[PDB]
Amino acid sequence: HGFVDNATIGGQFYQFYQPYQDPYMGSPPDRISRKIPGNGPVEDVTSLAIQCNADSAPAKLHASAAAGSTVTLRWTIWPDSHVGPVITYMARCPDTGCQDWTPSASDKVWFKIKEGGREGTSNVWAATPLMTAPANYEYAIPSCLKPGYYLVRHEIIALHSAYSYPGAQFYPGCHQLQVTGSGTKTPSSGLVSFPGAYKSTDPGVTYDAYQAATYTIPGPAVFTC
Ligand SMILES: *[C@@H]1O[C@H](CO)[C@@H](O[C@@H]2O[C@H](CO)[C@@H](O)[C@H](O)[C@H]2NC(C)=O)[C@H](O)[C@H]1NC(C)=O
Numbered sequence: 001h002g003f004v005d006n007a008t009i010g011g012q013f014y015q016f017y018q019p020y021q022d023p024y025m026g027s028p029p030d031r032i033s034r035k036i037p038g039n040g041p042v043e044d045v046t047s048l049a050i051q052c053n054a055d056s057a058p059a060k061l062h063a064s065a066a067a068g069s070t071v072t073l074r075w076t077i078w079p080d081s082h083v084g085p086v087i088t089y090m091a092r093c094p095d096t097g098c099q100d101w102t103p104s105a106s107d108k109v110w111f112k113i114k115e116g117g118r119e120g121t122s123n124v125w126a127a128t129p130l131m132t133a134p135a136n137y138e139y140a141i142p143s144c145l146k147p148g149y150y151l152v153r154h155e156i157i158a159l160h161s162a163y164s165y166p167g168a169q170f171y172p173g174c175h176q177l178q179v180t181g182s183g184t185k186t187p188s189s190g191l192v193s194f195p196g197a198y199k200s201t202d203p204g205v206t207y208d209a210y211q212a213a214t215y216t217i218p219g220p221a222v223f224t225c
């Protein structure tokens with residue numbers, strides 16, 4: 001249980017959508033990140049909720065950043081039972097902006113930019129550092145990306161209850177970037193849709209985290225420039 005609380009993008013601080021603050025205001029604040037219900041998991045890989053969380057909507061703002069630059073995401077406190085991989089994807093929005101665009105359930109627009117899984121057969125996972133404050137994560141915007149508006153999808157997949165399916169707990173959330181710079185590339189391989197990328201039967205989705213086994217991270221190969 002948790003969500004990305006804020007980030008540092010293009011050197012600037014952004015408070016993400018706040019599910020326990022924003023809905024109660026007379027006028028919810030403009031955000032660079034998309035609405036989420038709260039800190040609970042999505043458990044249905046066939047649902048659009050797996051994309052940007054349940055009952056989401058486009059965000060009003062974008063955060064400017066240079067291709068090749070580093071982004072920091074800061075999670076709320078991550079429970080130590082919630083071992084699992086941490087994965088980040090991007091998708092290019094229309095040049096008219098992400099603010100009124102949501103990929104459809106069959107839009108193969110998402111490319112994986114970073115992933116981490118289980119360290120060998122140990123109990124150390126990519127989620128582990130987030131279990132000790134400050135709960136911080138970094139990713140690099142690929143340096144070759146053509147300037148434009150992009151959605152970023154970030155998730156932890158907690159596997160403490162994933163022996164069968166449904167069981168795996170997905171904690172996805174999306175934020176919006178204006179990528180700038182000298183890049184010329186638009187990813188056109190390793191593209192997937194959400195839903196679609198993950199199947200209930202994937203070895204990393206139905207998974208026994210309490211046996212001494214290695215872990216196959218779900219989804220496509222990582223994009224490389
Ligand atoms: C950024 O979001 C993070 C994560 O929720 C906040 O980090 C708590 O911040 C306090 C005060 O700085 C620390 O003592 C805790 O250790 C932090 N918790 C975690 C889970 O890291 C942080 O305060 C937010 N930043 C801003 C500027 O509001």
Ligand SMILES: [O-][O-]
Pocket residue numbers: 001079
């Ligand atoms: O509820 O964790």
Ligand SMILES: [Cu+2]
Pocket residue numbers: 001002079082
């Ligand atoms: Cu939880």
